[PDB]
Amino acid sequence: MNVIFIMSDDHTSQAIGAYGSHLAKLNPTPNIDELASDGVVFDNCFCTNSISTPSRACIMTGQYSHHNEVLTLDEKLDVDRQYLVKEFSKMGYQTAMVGKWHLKNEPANFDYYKVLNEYFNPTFLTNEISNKEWPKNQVKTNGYSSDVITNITIDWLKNRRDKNKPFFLMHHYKAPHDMFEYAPRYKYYLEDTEVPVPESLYNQDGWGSEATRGKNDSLRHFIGTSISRRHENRSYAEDYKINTGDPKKDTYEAYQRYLKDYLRCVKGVDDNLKRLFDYLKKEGLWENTIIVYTGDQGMMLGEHDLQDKRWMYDESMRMPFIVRDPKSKQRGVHNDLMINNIDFAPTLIELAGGKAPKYMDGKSFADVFEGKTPANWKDEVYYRYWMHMIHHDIPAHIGIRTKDYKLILFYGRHYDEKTMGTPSMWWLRDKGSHKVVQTPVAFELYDLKKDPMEMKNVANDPEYKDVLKDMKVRLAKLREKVGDTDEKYPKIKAIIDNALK
């Protein structure tokens, strides 16, 4: 069967109606919900490292960041590590890459590519041009990027695809990534509707730890960019220049404007999927094509007064992940198996008739689509955010999540010693940027059954003493087992080993 892998940049699970959040009553994604109504919604799909380039490298390689080497936004994925597409090509698929490309090197292992690397009249690099090589093979387009990107894929399917060969197509939207430049036809979408506000926008009593707030909350203006003006250097309230005279009203108005601009970008993607899905039905591909819809990671939409991703908190860590397999009987169902973006490539390869590659860290959960739990499937996932402080003043951390608990260890250092001591926000160099410095080392523990919104860090609660001890052992063992043991980074190894002992 064919495969279309659709991924939107920073499309978080709260903003898909099928995940049933407080936003779902706005019906933000009717066409994604219709896809979900005939497929599987995975409730427990997590990235291992919540930023665009690392997550996409995990998808492409089936490997953890410390193996594929894409630790942060700053790194590139080697061409010869484009494993997912190389495996499909080896099964005789024609391969195509369309849209937003974060992996920096040429998509050279794709038969066809037309990529960004721009919200209006985007320019693409594409090997449809004969007399120019990457990165000079550029083509200008007219119009809004979500509409243009959808047309590139439909035009490829209609006019270029070899109709006698199966295809593997990665279809990547730039929306709804910052700066949420939505198409002007959506300017008044939601204009008169209040976006539901999470109570954690204002109430953070019990959330976090000394690692994320400082002793005596001494670092709340330092760690974690904000919706409110809590963070002294970067916030939506300041960026939007909202100044009503009431800081809670400022926070409310910045939240509303953030969420509405974001949901207008989501709406543009969802409307374009109607056009793509209608084409696939008309062309006769709907019943022989596996369709995946996912976001590369989640996003904090103001929960706990936080923004962006990177955090291991569930809104950022969880990826929306919807699969419609037309040969499966799992249609209109949810599945709670604990899965990672590193599992996507082996699962897709098996769903397309191949064998899970043994050099990958991830494993195939393809059995789910036959109504069976895969053999010896993990009940915990590992998480690590490496990019200490840069851009959003979020400290580096590792963690483990089960179905029942999440344990986070903030180790609060950058792995690159030369980066320690630099400004975290380059645009505020010599304008008061915080510096990339050691932040407090602490654990956070969340009881996910009683406290799914992660409002209450119970790491220091006596009632949770045994759970904490057990979770630290589980974290220490998983980290050793996946090989993320920091021999290259002695200062961090010492912090983490000492904290887990």
Helix (H) or strand (E) holding 168: strand 167-173
Tell me the residue nearest to Ca ion as measured from the CB.
52
For residue 73 the two structure tokens come to 């936004």
Interface with Ca ion, residue 296, by CB under 5 A: yes
CB 65 within 8 A of CB 71: yes
DSSP 381-450: EEEEE---STTT-PPPEEEEEESSEEEEEE----S-TTTTTSBSSGGGTTTTPPB------EEEEEETTT
205 marked as binding residue: no
Smallest gap, in angstroms, from Cβ of residue 111 to Ca ion? 25
Site string for Ni ion, 32-61 (x = CB under 5 A): ------------------------x-----
Q: Which does 146 bind (CB under 5 to 8 A by kind): Ni ion, Ca ion, none?
A: Ni ion
Q: Which residue carries 């593997």 as its tokens? A: 168
Site for Ni ion, residues 84 to 103, rule: CB under 5 A? 101-102
Site for Ca ion, residues 267 to 286, rule: CB under 5 A? none
10 marked as binding residue: yes
Smallest gap, in angstroms, from Cβ of residue 374 to Ca ion? 27
Question: Tell me, what amino acid is at 281?
Answer: K
Cα 250 to Cα 227: distance, rounded to the nearest angstrom: 9
Site for Ni ion, residues 169 to 198, rule: CB under 5 A? 173-175
Closest CA to 435 of 453, 454, 457, 413: 413
For residue 312 the two structure tokens come to 């291991």
For residue 106 the two structure tokens come to 């040429």
Smallest gap, in angstroms, from Cβ of residue 468 to Ni ion? 37
Interface with Ca ion, residue 109, by CB under 5 A: no
Smallest gap, in angstroms, from Cβ of residue 295 to Ca ion? 7
Which residue number, 56 or 479, has a Cβ lying nearer to Ni ion?
56
343 marked as binding residue: no
With contacts defined by CB under 5 A, how many residues of the chain interact with Ni ion?
A: 8
For residue 152, what are the CA distances in angstroms to 141, 158, 262?
Answer: 10, 10, 24
Helix (H) or strand (E) holding 263: helix 247-283
Which residue number, 133 or 178, has a Cβ lying nearer to Ca ion?
178
Site for Ca ion, residues 13 to 72, rule: CB under 5 A? 52
Interface with Ni ion, residue 145, by CB under 5 A: yes
The footprint of Ni ion (CB under 5 A) covers 56, 101-102, 145-146, 173-175
The footprint of Ca ion (CB under 5 A) covers 9-10, 52, 296
User: Annotated binding site for Ca(2+): which residue ranges?
Assistant: 9-10, 52, 296
